[PDB]
Curated annotation (Swiss-Prot), chain A:
Protein name per its UniProtKB record: Guanine nucleotide-binding protein G(I)/G(S)/G(O) subunit gamma-2
Family: Belongs to the G protein gamma family.
Organism this protein belongs to: Bos taurus
GO CC terms of this entry: heterotrimeric G-protein complex; membrane; plasma membrane
Major subcellular site: membrane
Organ and tissue specificity: Adrenal gland and brain.
Subunit structure and binding partners: G proteins are composed of 3 units, alpha, beta and gamma. In this context, interacts with GNB2. The heterodimer formed by GNB1 and GNG2 interacts with ARHGEF5. The heterodimer formed by GNB1 and GNG2 interacts with GRK2. Component of the TAS2R14-GNAI1 complex, consisting of TAS2R14, GNAI1, GNB1 and GNG2. Forms complexes with TAS2R14 and G-proteins; these complexes play a role in the perception of bitterness. Component of the TAS2R14-GNAT3 complex, consisting of TAS2R14, GNAT3, GNB1 and GNG2. Component of the TAS2R14-GNAS2 complex, consisting of TAS2R14, GNAS2, GNB1 and GNG2.
Membrane association type: Lipid-anchor
Lineage: Eukaryota, Metazoa, Chordata, Craniata, Vertebrata
MF (Gene Ontology): G-protein beta-subunit binding; GTPase activity
UniProtKB/Swiss-Prot annotation, chain C:
PANTHER family: GUANINE NUCLEOTIDE-BINDING PROTEIN BETA G PROTEIN BETA (PTHR19850)
Name of the molecule in the record: Guanine nucleotide-binding protein G(I)/G(S)/G(T) subunit beta-1
Positions where Phosphoserine occurs in the chain: S1
Post-translational modification: Phosphorylation at His-265 by NDKB contributes to G protein activation by increasing the high energetic phosphate transfer onto GDP.
Disulphide bridges: none
Gene Ontology MF terms: GTPase activity; GTPase binding; protein-containing complex binding; signaling receptor complex adaptor activity
Location of N-acetylserine modifications: S1
PROSITE patterns in UniProt: WD_REPEATS_1 (PS00678), WD_REPEATS_2 (PS50082), WD_REPEATS_REGION (PS50294)
Length: 64, 524, 339, 49
């Protein structure tokens, strides 16, 4: 029962070679990027900053 | 010895006593004739007193004993006396006359050919085949490790070990074959030593020339002549063979209990409930013995695989083209049901090399009485229009109970995953003992429907909801044999067969019910 | 020989990956985010309630229009709601009552669902006769359909309990691509803003980034101590969060190919059922198996708020494409919109 | 014990044999009447044993 274990263990090692063959980026820069993304799109997010009730479709109008 | 055997017999037919007695007799060949005479006398005490109860155990005891008795005196009247004893039972109901006719056939075989029964049984058990008369009775064991018990697992492991050998098996069979006929005029040691020096091929040529006359002499009307003409046949064979003087010796050569070489036992682990394991094993004139351990839940699964295999092989005979199937149930609800019914089953095999494995290599060779439960054929229908008739054997379910079962049997899903009533039509036939069925029809708002056991009858738990909100429940059991359930396409219900979650079914719009080789067995 | 050398090559390449990741692990997100002003307390209110489901709700998915939303429920039904009006735009009865997932198409014309039927049933809302007709039964999966997301009207990715995902072409009814590799049931998936990549979470307590284009596993992320129940991309598409039965969420960046942040608390002991990001991503909304739906500051990792409007497990939740409202379906048979 | 039903059945039959098997019989209700050896023709409201 080696033909299965070997065919499996080869996929594993061919997969692990795939994952290791990537140019990673410093975690610090990943964070800086995400923080500055939220900083960029924070205004367009009504969940973060409460918007006026007039712009809220679920509280100021029943006709749509 | 005599009184001990008689008193142990009195204990035998009143849990391991059967074994104590087989061992006691096995010690010194003398005991066998004592026990046989005692049995016979007792069977005439019944031939004349009554109490049908005690015919089956006594017939079994006689069969078991005479089956292995090392040798009968040429002048002994024991077999003819036994024939005269059992030739007076034909005036009894069925099956007593059937048992007795079969036993008389066995006695006919004995007289016409000594040691024919033991040699046939073992040659079937050991898989050794003559070029003409082939025989194989292979006992394969099905065991799920976590369900079976330690000791039992040890028994299975030991049985899997190929204890006997073909050459040792041939030696033992030639020994018993010569000792049943010649007996005290044959020195065991002598032959046995003029035997081990031989080879497997010639041991076969001989055991074959032997079994062939063991048959041809059995099939002749002059049992006494056939007998002496068989002693003579074996003599004329043993002369050529090359152990002359070993036989027909004027000394009182002693007799001893030659054992029964265990049959070819294979073990296969059951991490399954379907019998596809059996076909896969097969992928690796004869019979096959399957022995399984009886757990409580396993019940349903076991009986549902019984039904599935039967119908599958009915569609196409594959496992029944070269082997005949024999399935054995070993306790470890059906167990309770059979426990109080058959006192012989509750005495010998309900409770259960080691004693356990002798009483399991014993039970499995004698019991030949199939007692079967009424399989229930049920044809379902879905919204898609699929119709098939698959069986349940212990109980059926429908409604929210089967959905709950699936809800928890989902594992990955059961971690990420009220009984709405069902407006269904119930058309059930209250059966009549006289045959005058009584129809009654309703439509009721019931949540779950549970067929349960009581030709047989089926009790049915109904769960009526008079009002939804904690639905109201009025559970009523009513005896019914043919029941028809009609459910609108817009009211599919979760149907489960045999309480096993592997067969929880949905989308059913209609369920028809009506009571309806491989046998399951019961000792008496 | 060949298998022991291949096993030691596997277990050497693994520590090469661990060292390639530890090299980039210079600073944590909690340090970098220590300075930024906390988000405060996200006081949320139940705006709507969507009644009509007769039993547990198993899934829901917003439409790209932000107004319509599908929801699959234990009662065997798939309802399309108009969140603004609370009226049921559709009440589709399913052939199999064991529905577990649903997915409004981005166009709004198609909806998909599936479950233990091992089939991804695609339905058409804009039918020739205007009825709710079944366009396709995408069959082929050997396990329960656990989740699926439309790429378009004609393409759809589905995950299954066979430890695989698959891209389908609805026209042919055939598995365009098959995404094998998981060693456990794939509970969830999520298409990136770029439809060429998607991540998937499985019961192996690990997530995997897949290439829709080719069909190969690009990266594999670990860290969870239990089954991953839900997964989705960060709005930008360079990161994704996973919720697990170990009572924790975790954030993974693709470019850094490692965990950035953990979201958990000693008080929180039950697993996470669902996760979603706000339009900006500053807020992470995690569903739990204690009738709660906690709001986390994605950067501070602090529990900003709690949505407690359900009597039973908060099974599913979503956010509109405009982030204007949060839907949460639950086992209490009711969905609830929040703002 | 106030008699309410009766029925009879021969044990040997006309052709010199003994009766053997399952038998379902319909009872008469209540002389030469009690020696009858035939079954009630009322097959739909008679007591069957």
């Amino acid at each position: 029962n080696n033909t299965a274990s070997i065919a499996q263990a080869r996929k594993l090692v061919e997969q692990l070679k795939m994952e290791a063959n990537i140019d990673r980026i410093k975690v610090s820069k990943a964070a800086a990027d995400l923080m500055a993304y939220c900083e960029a799109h924070a205004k367009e997010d009504p969940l973060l900053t409460p918007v006026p009730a007039s712009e809220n479709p679920f509280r100021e109008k029943k006709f749509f | 010895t005599e009184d001990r055997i008689q008193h142990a017999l009195e204990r035998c037919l009143h849990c391991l006593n059967c074994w104590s007695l087989q061992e006691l007799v096995s010690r010194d060949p003398g005991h066998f004739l004592i026990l046989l005479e005692q049995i016979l006398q007792k069977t005439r005490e019944v031939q004349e007193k009554g109490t049908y109860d005690l015919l089956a155990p006594l017939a079994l005891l006689f069969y078991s004993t005479v089956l292995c008795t090392p040798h009968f005196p040429p002048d002994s009247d024991l077999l003819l006396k036994a024939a005269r004893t059992y030739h007076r039972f034909l005036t009894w109901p069925v099956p007593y006359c059937s048992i007795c006719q079969e036993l008389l056939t066995f006695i006919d075989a004995e007289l016409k050919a000594p040691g024919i029964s033991y040699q046939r049984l073992v040659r079937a058990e050991q898989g050794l085949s003559t070029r003409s008369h082939r025989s194989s009775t292979v006992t394969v064991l099905l065991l799920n490790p976590v369900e079976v018990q330690a000791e039992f697992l040890d028994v299975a492991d030991k049985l899997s070990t190929p204890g006997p050998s073909p050459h040792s098996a041939y030696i033992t069979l030639l020994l018993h074959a010569f000792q049943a006929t010649f007996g005290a005029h044959c020195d065991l040691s002598g032959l046995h030593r003029r035997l081990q020096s031989k080879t497997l091929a010639e041991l076969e040529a001989i055991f074959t020339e032997t079994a062939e006359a063991q048959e041809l002499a059995s099939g002749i009307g002059d049992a006494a002549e056939a007998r002496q003409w068989l002693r003579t046949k074996l003599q004329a064979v043993g002369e050529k063979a090359g152990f002359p003087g070993v036989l027909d010796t004027a000394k009182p050569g002693k007799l001893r209990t030659i054992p029964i070489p265990v049959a070819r036992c294979y073990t296969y682990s059951w991490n399954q409930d379907s019998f596809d394991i059996l076909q896969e094993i097969l992928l690796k004139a004869s019979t096959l013995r399957v022995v399984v351990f009886g757990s409580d839940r396993i019940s349903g699964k076991v009986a549902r695989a019984y039904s599935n295999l039967r119908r599958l092989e009915n569609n196409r005979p594959l496992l029944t083209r070269f082997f005949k199937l024999q399935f054995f149930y070993v306790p470890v609800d059906i167990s309770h049901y059979l426990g109080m019914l058959d006192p012989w089953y509750e005495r010998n095999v309900l409770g259960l090399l080691p004693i356990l494995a002798d009483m399991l290599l014993y039970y499995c060779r004698f019991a030949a009485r199939p007692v079967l439960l009424q399989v229930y054929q049920t044809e379902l229908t879905f919204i898609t229009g699929e119709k098939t008739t698959e069986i349940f054997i212990h109980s059926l379910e429908l409604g929210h109970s089967a959905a709950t079962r699936a809800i928890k049997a989902s594992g990955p899903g059961s971690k990420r995953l009220e009984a709405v009533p069902l407006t269904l039509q119930i058309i059930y036939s209250k059966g009549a003992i006289s045959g005058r069925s009584r129809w009654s029809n309703m439509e009721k708002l019931c949540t779950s429907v549970n067929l349960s056991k009581a030709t047989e009858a089926l009790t049915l738990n109904l769960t009526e909801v008079v009002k939804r909100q904690f639905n109201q429940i009025s559970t009523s059991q009513i005896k019914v044999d043919k029941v028809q359930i009609i459910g609108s396409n817009s009211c599919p219900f979760a149907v489960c067969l045999d309480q096993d979650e592997r067969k929880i079914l949905q989308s059913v719009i209609r369920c028809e019910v009506s009571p309806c080789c491989l046998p399951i067995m019961t000792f008496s | 020989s060949e298998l022991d050398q291949l096993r030691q090559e596997a277990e050497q390449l693994k520590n090469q990956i661990r060292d390639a990741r530890k090299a980039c692990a210079d600073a944590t997100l909690s340090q970098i985010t220590n300075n930024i002003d906390p988000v405060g307390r996200i006081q949320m209110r139940t705006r709507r309630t969507l009644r009509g489901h007769l039993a547990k709700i198993y899934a829901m998915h917003w439409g790209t229009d932000s107004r319509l939303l599908v929801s699959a429920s234990q009662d065997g039904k798939l309802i399309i709601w108009d969140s603004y009006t609370t009226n049921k735009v559709h009440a589709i009865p399913l052939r199999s009552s064991w529905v577990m997932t649903c997915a409004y198409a981005p166009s709004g014309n198609y909806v998909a669902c599936g479950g233990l039927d091992n089939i991804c049933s695609i339905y058409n809302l804009k039918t020739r006769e205007g009825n709710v007709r079944v366009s396709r039964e995408l069959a082929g999966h050997t396990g329960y359909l656990s989740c699926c997301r439309f790429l378009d009207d004609n393409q759809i990715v589905t995950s299954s309990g066979d430890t695989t995902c698959a891209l389908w072409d609805i026209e042919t009814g055939q598995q365009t691509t098959t995404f094998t590799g998981h060693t456990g049931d794939v509970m969830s998936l999520s298409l990136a803003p770029d439809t060429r990549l998607f991540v998937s979470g499985a019961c192996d307590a690990s997530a995997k980034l897949w290439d829709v284009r080719e069909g190969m596993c690009r990266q594999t992320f670990t860290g969870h101590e239990s089954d991953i129940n839900a997964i989705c991309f960060f709005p930008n598409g360079n990161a994704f969060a996973t919720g697990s039965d170990d009572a924790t969420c975790r954030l993974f960046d693709l470019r850094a190919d490692q965990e950035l942040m953990t979201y958990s608390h000693d008080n929180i002991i039950c697993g996470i059922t669902s996760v979603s990001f706000s339009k900006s991503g500053r807020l992470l909304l995690a569903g739990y198996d204690d009738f709660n739906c906690n709001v986390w500051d994605a950067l501070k990792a602090d529990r900003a708020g709690v949505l407690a409007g359900h009597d039973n497990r908060v099974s599913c939740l979503g956010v509109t494409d405009d982030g204007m409202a949060v839907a949460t379906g639950s086992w209490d048979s009711f969905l609830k919109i929040w703002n | 014990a106030q008699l309410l039903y009766y029925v009879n059945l021969l044990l040997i039959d006309h052709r010199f044999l003994l009766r053997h098997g399952e038998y379902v019989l319909h009872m008469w209700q209540l002389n030469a009447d009690k020696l009858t050896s035939a079954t009630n023709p009322d097959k739909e409201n008679s007591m069957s044993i």
